[PDB]
Write a protein that binds this ligand. Sequence first.
Ligand SMILES: [Cl-]
Ligand SMILES: [Cl-]
Lengths: 216, 212, 127, 113
Amino acid sequence: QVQLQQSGAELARPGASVKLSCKASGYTFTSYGITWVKQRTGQGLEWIGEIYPRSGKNWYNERFKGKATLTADTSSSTAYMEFRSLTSEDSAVYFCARTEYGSSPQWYFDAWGTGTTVTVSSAKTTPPSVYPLAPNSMVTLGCLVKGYFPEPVTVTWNSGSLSSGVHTFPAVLQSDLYTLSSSVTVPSSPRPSETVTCNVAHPASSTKVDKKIVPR
Amino acid sequence: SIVMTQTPKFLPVTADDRVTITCKASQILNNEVAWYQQKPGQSPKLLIFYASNRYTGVPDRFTGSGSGTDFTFTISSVQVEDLAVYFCQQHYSSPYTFGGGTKLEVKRADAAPTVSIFPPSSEQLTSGGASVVCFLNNFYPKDINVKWKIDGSERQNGVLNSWTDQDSKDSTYSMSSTLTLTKDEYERHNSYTCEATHKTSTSPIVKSFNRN
Amino acid sequence: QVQLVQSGAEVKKPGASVKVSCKASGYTFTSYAMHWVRQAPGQRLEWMGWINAGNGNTKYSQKFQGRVTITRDTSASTAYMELSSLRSEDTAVYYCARVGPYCGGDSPQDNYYMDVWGKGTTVTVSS
Amino acid sequence: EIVLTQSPGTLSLSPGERATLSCRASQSVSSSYLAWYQQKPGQAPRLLIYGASSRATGIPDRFSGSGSGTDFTLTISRLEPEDFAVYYCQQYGSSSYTFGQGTKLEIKRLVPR
Ligand SMILES: [Cl-]
Ligand SMILES: [Cl-]
């Protein structure tokens, strides 16, 4: 089983540097190459460069030569990519992948790694402010989770007893913080008669909040 | 930097449909084109390499062909487990470049968005801020526009939007638009409105509330 | 285990053509180049041409341009060598050989020797 | 073209002795583009040395490659009966791929003693 385990999500400040890890297992590390691909959330892939661990020889995309540096440690079967002078444009998911090799590098990648999410920001760990959202047969309620950093948060409704008719929207960046929203739809008889509560947790700040949706 | 023009970018499909994805290169290649599958929140998986060759484990319904400038990737009969984004890639010369991608979705009957507007909560107003939230839930197709109006005056700045992916159950889409003001300006106006423009209706779906 | 299995011996008349096959197994066929070599009775090893099993590009010897045709079949992991308008001097053993694996050196040219050889295909041009 | 001239054409030696084969190029060739091969009668050639001095997989230590430029040398430390065969050198640079005429390493015939 080919496997490329990538380090945890990196959080760096602008102008700082980061070094991503890519530990390989399930095959002979020195028999293949390791490329790195950039993927900004919601769009295509971008090739960064290549390294051949057995010899250390590396190829680069001209766009990343000064910013990225590819190394590898055959003793630990780990590939590294160091980024310098980080900017908001560098925030993305970074994959490592194993490259096919024969009589020469083939430059297509048959095994991809976990994926490391890099966030370039100066924000500090901030807990969310959870705000209820209140206004026929159905009733739609909401839960506004605003001003937290970093990702992620978890959201449930009545401790999970409300699972159908629920969907949470992706977080957006608002004032260098994250803002999220969750929607729950229940029959109009259950509420306002029977309480509806949104359970929000922000593991990074070690905060839990339960906000009851009150009618106006 | 060779350009791989991949079409279509978005493709609705029904189970057992024949999917055909095209990928045109900006210059003449031999056959160094590979194809990848990426499911939401997952890593890409190689499917085809050198235009025609399947990778280990790939089912037979996935095929690829082409040479020179035109390359095609076909699914004989799409399955539910095949719903994902598909990329072509050229492994001919450096820098190696991928296509724009092709996202599949489950075809579905049209559905109008259930619109719901929520005024700022009492809790939030204790912080000098006010967020008006608008939900546009369970509509198809995905294409939709949301417009805000304060006392009938269109509002642009301060509006952040967010879209869900296609729901696994009802195969619908949902959106949330959030107008965020200061408590000061929020109290300078009376009515607040979000208008949803969707192909299911020639006139927008309007929801409003009065701060008083 | 890397193996190149060639087709059986051939006996042709002058003017005919012959096509030799080279079934490859034990490695990614499309990731390597392949050489074709012949050796006439009591003569040197003679290079004839190589083919990129991936894209199919070929380079032929100038002593054989026009007569030799090297092709590939990725679906079958088989290379082919066709020699037309045969004459007595073409009586020889024809070999297919895969090149070596790319070490991380200057260029793949550092490993375009004949790493793995086939066992040979005898072609005899009589009468 | 790049012509390779091996010498001697025939080398008659006994087991236990040292054999020294020479491959001379008409032009200067990079060491990384020089290969040696061994061919026993009836068999197919076998890779022996690549890159002028790198042994192929499963090649005894008594085989050693050397040289550079226009003069390359294959040396067999101590001859074993399995080592008597034909030996070809090859230049596999970008230009073309050419073999030498080959050295015939024979078993020396002796007078009774
Ligand atoms: Cl990820
Ligand atoms: Cl080798």
